Design a protein around this nucleic acid. Structure first.
Ligand SMILES: [Zn+2]
Lengths: 93, 97, 62, 55, 82, 108, 142, 81, 96, 94, 108
DNA sequence: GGAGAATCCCGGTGCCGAGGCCGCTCAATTGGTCGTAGACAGCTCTAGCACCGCTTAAACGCACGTACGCGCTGTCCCCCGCGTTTTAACCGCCAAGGGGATTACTCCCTAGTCTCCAGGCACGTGTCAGATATATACATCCTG
DNA sequence: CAGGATGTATATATCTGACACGTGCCTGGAGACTAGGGAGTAATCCCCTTGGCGGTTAAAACGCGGGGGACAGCGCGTACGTGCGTTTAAGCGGTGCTAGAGCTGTCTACGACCAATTGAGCGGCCTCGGCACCGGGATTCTCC
């Protein structure tokens, strides 16, 4: 009885926030989970590489900001960095 | 009688198959091919149906991409018929050989 | 005297309760008095022996 | 109707929201990144529209 | 010992409909051998990684995750199988 | 003790900040992990998921359907330039292809 | 944004907020009355208002100043309400906020309270909650 | 400030690059397109290099930063540590 | 006295494919690099080794692109490379 | 005074063992160091991924064998595996 | 005065530093713990690859009537060998040039 | 086949980058000990493999005729080769200094443990969006 | 341009099963806490970068001539799409078997960790010779 974890619940919540009256197929949820895991792995690997390059040992908002700027292209990165800073601001406040 | 001029049926086939998402190869011969290929690396191997489906999906996507590239190359050659020269050029340019 | 928050400088002499200082901070900045705590209500600045230019540090909001 | 729906000031460089809402350029470019990326009037999401019309 | 005739299992109409999905107008007759050669090369490359993943796992069957890892390591990440 | 409030609720997010932190500290990415890093990462992931889902829903509603399918996901990804560039080397199962025909092949 | 503050104030002057009341321009004093058929009925409750320089895009700093027995209000008068923390929107008036506050006074929320003990009392013994709330309304609000 | 530095890539330089590439004959319109392609490539590399530099909080772009920017695009370069 | 066209092109192909010298002028290349970098952070400073590495990478990339476009032009049954060949090569390689 | 480390000495030793009467440029040594670092990073990353996939926590020679088989193609991979197995056998005997 | 210091490379008859490889492994955040034979195997593989590359470069240099190995020789050796070419198809070498070849169509 | 223009090679020269010598210290080794990850036995059962049988849509094979691939030809313009003129790269030299690399240190942030609980997981469930069927209108092509 | 042959989208019916919903429980997230070390900050030193200058000259831009190759055109052969009639394994479904995946429970070799020791590589500091260079003779390719 191993409890396996995914992002299905949170993906469903975000879907309800965006389109309150739209469903999603079960296989599409697997695709969304794979996408989330892939993006998480990419960002974590880039942050780890940045930390190693700077001879540091801690991962902060600076490393993730740099990784997001490196990965996401163009206007997509601008909004993403804006969202992350706002979330940090509320959490710190 | 009734006889469509050549090309129109090809165009309607393109429209049909670019709108569907089904697999375009037969499952049993694909499985036989996969088992034949894998039998020389190691014998008496077993496969999951999910693994075979993933292999078929990847192979079909790769072939569709290769066909798009070779169609673009053939059109660049001021032609409308694909030939193995175009496929070889696409493979060479994409660095697969 | 002087008081530092770890931020509004300066504040009252070591004679007022922490509630009054929290209310003054809330009025001057907008941060709630209960946000977040006192780190260094009923006790006063003299009870904690807070001298001039002391370094003080300022919840379950939801 | 010449005033903005939020600021109540004169509409300077009016911006048309996809949900038929009219608001001035200061108020629009403030509410783009102000609170929720959503329309205050009818909760119409505009992030994709904003990205499309920025370029 | 599975025979080598299975490469012919990829039928000429199947290749033609794959080309149709790819956007091909018409196909030369010589293409149907080049395409199945390319497909067999690609499948050999992917399976060579899948089988060694399974062997390192000390298993006797090939899971879907082994194929996913093999495709990912070739810059061909696949979604929909975990 | 006291009322328990989740870090996602603190940041007003939807993704699990605690789960993200656990994955970071279990993935052997660094010896120590900063406090705001899981928050920033969860925010970025939530934004990306919302961006993809909005386009998928628009594609589905343009197709007069109410459930999002891998075909809709593929159309949404391949129609946006930024998402296409981000996922240029990604294959979606049961996604199909973007319908387009070169103008040369059209009859004239 | 001062005009928006005054326009809302002028509209609030035009439309009084029923039993509740508010007004001073960043610091305003809000005085509300006990909702009908409630343990707090009859008592008058005072509230504080701080206007940040982001209204109406940021909720005002609003808290209670009258001692009360309510799970969703702490001893310092802070308020646990979505429209003040999460559901804030520039498309609502302060009168709607006052009405929601009155509803919360009539209908406390034990799932996400500010005083866990009062929330436990409200969830377990509703009569005890009503009695203690009425007692505190008489002692402080009256 | 400065501008119109893209013309520093002269037609003989482009011709030498093409000859090293193994081109016998060159059309006249190749030069503007080569300028554009090189500009795009340099923008893509320099963006990541500058991001790497500004992450480390220094005003000097280094060979290691350039190497990292090239490596993240799958075009690893040797001879610079 | 004149050589027939193309012979000196072949001889210079032989000359350049054997030498490893840099084919772009360092001063204008560095000016271009600084001009491009002006659009991200102002008053930036560069290392000589970094500039040389950028030049090496740029030259290698352009040489590869020219090889691919020459291959495409030959496939088109001609010897003169044209911008459509470069566009085809870049599109097939996935750069656009 | 950062005492930077590289593989110049060992590369020179291997070069002398292969060709006793051949020199090497300074820039060539840097290229060799970069190549060694790149290959080491590739193999270490592949071994770490294998260990994570198999839900392990120890990187052993068995994982490195699979990483080499994944990275090096064909005859080169076979020779590398043979050399590594011989070296590990000799080390274990010693 | 415990024992004569003999390196693990000397035990295995290798050249690359087994101790340095082990230190780099345990300092690289690759895993919690490192096996005993892993550094030895990795050093052996690296030594074999370097030996092969140096042999090819030396043969190329002697075919060029030279005695010093240069990046041009390294590039020629890497591009000539199919195995090394496939291994390093995405690798750029400074001062390497190109492999000399001309298509038969261009020849008169 | 000869002239000429370039290319390769041999010889003398000088330099400067590759090769060799000397601390010494820090990174390598050796030896103990202990918690534990991993190796192994053992039991369970789920999924993979193999089979049979009936349906049938898909694959296969043939005819043709038509549209396309390819060869030939004129042209013609533009691209290569050349020479003359123009200019900016470059090597050398010097100077100013902003900024990169280290040290101290201290302090604040994060690891670690304990205790508690609630949000998510595995599991029922019913209903509702999608599919199939069939009769429509509607658009497309094609041969006249 | 028109009407018929032929697909093709659509409305409505009814099925059906997939997913949005509800529930017991459990373990991973949250909280309070202490301690320790990672890093933020200042100050400092010096070093590589920026900037300038002047003489050289090799490189770049202009321009003219001509020839050759890209291109439109044309004619012709052929091969491939389109249709129709004839096989055939794919597919479903169903059954049955069993090997290997997955798990739990023990137990031990072993790898992290600390203490103690010492010598190999880094840095410096040299010496010389591999090679760049320059002049000249011999060879070769290209063109008329
Ligand atoms: Zn406005």
């Amino acid at each position: 009885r191993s409890r396996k974890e995914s992002y299905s619940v949170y993906v469903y919540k975000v879907l309800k926030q965006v389109h309150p009256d739209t469903g999603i197929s079960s296989k599409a949820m697997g695709i969304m989970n794979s996408f989330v895991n892939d993006i998480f792995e990419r960002i974590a690997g880039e942050a780890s590489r940045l930390a190693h390059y700077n001879k540091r040992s801690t991962i902060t908002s600076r490393e993730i900001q740099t990784a997001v700027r490196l990965l996401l292209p163009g206007e997509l990165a601008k909004h993403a960095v804006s969202e992350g800073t706002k979330a940090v601001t509320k959490y710190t406040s | 009688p009734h006889r469509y001029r050549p090309g129109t049926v090809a165009l309607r086939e393109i429209r049909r198959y670019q709108k569907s998402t089904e697999l375009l190869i037969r499952k049993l011969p694909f499985q036989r091919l996969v088992r034949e290929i894998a039998q020389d690396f190691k014998t008496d191997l077993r496969f999951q149906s999910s693994a075979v489906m993933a292999l078929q999906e990847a192979s079909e996507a790769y072939l569709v991409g290769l066909f798009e590239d070779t169609n673009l190359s053939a059109i660049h050659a001021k032609r409308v018929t694909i030939m193995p020269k175009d496929i070889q050029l696409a493979r060479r340019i994409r660095g697969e050989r | 005297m002087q008081i530092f928050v770890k931020t509004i400088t300066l504040e009252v002499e070591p004679s007022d309760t922490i509630e009054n200082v929290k209310a003054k901070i809330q009025d001057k900045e907008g941060i709630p008095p209960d946000q977040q705590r006192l780190i260094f209500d009923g006790r006063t600045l003299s009870d904690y022996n807070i001298q001039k230019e002391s370094t003080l540090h300022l919840l379950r909001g939801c | 109707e010449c005033q903005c729906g939020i600021c109540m000031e004169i509409l300077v460089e009016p911006v048309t929201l996809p949900c038929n809402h009219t608001l001035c350029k200061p108020c629009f470019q403030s509410t783009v990144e102000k609170a929720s990326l959503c329309c205050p009037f009818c909760r119409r999401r505009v992030s994709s529209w904003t990205r499309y019309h920025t370029r | 010992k599975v025979l080598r005739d299975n490469i012919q299992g990829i039928t000429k109409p199947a290749i033609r409909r794959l080309a149709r999905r790819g956007g091909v107008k018409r196909i030369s007759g010589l293409i149907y051998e080049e395409t199945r050669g390319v497909l067999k090369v690609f499948l050999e490359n992917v399976i060579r990684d899948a089988v060694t993943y399974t062997e390192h796992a000390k298993r006797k069957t090939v899971t879907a995750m082994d194929v996913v890892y093999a495709l990912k390591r070739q810059g061909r990440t696949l979604y929909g199988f975990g | 003790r006291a009322k328990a409030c989740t870090r996602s609720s603190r940041a007003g997010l939807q993704f699990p900040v605690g789960r993200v932190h656990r994955l970071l500290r279990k993935g052997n990415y660094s010896e120590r992990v900063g406090a705001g890093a899981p928050v920033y990462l969860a925010a970025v992931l939530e934004y990306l998921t919302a961006e993809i889902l909005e386009l998928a829903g628009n594609a589905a509603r343009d197709n007069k359907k109410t459930r999002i399918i891998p075909r809709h996901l593929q159309l949404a990804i391949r129609n946006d330039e930024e998402l296409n560039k981000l996922l240029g080397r990604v294959t979606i199962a049961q996604g199909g292809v973007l319908p387009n025909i070169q103008a040369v092949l059209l009859p004239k | 944004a001062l005009k928006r503050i005054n326009k809302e104030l002028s509209d609030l002057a035009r439309d009084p907020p029923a039993q509740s009341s508010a007004g001073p321009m960043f610091h305003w004093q809000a005085t509300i009355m006990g909702p009908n058929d409630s343990p707090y009925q009859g008592g008058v409750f005072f509230l504080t208002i701080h206007f940040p320089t982001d209204y109406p895009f940021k909720p005002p700093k609003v808290a209670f100043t009258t001692r009360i027995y309510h799970p969703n209000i702490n001893s310092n008068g802070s308020i646990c309400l979505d429209i003040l923390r999460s559901q804030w929107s520039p498309a609502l008036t302060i009168s709607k906020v006052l009405l929601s506050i009155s509803s919360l006074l009539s209908d406390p929320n034990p799932d996400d309270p500010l005083v866990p003990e009062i929330a436990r009392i409200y969830k377990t013994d509703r009569d005890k909650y009503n009695r203690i709330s009425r007692e505190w309304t008489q002692k402080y609000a009256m």
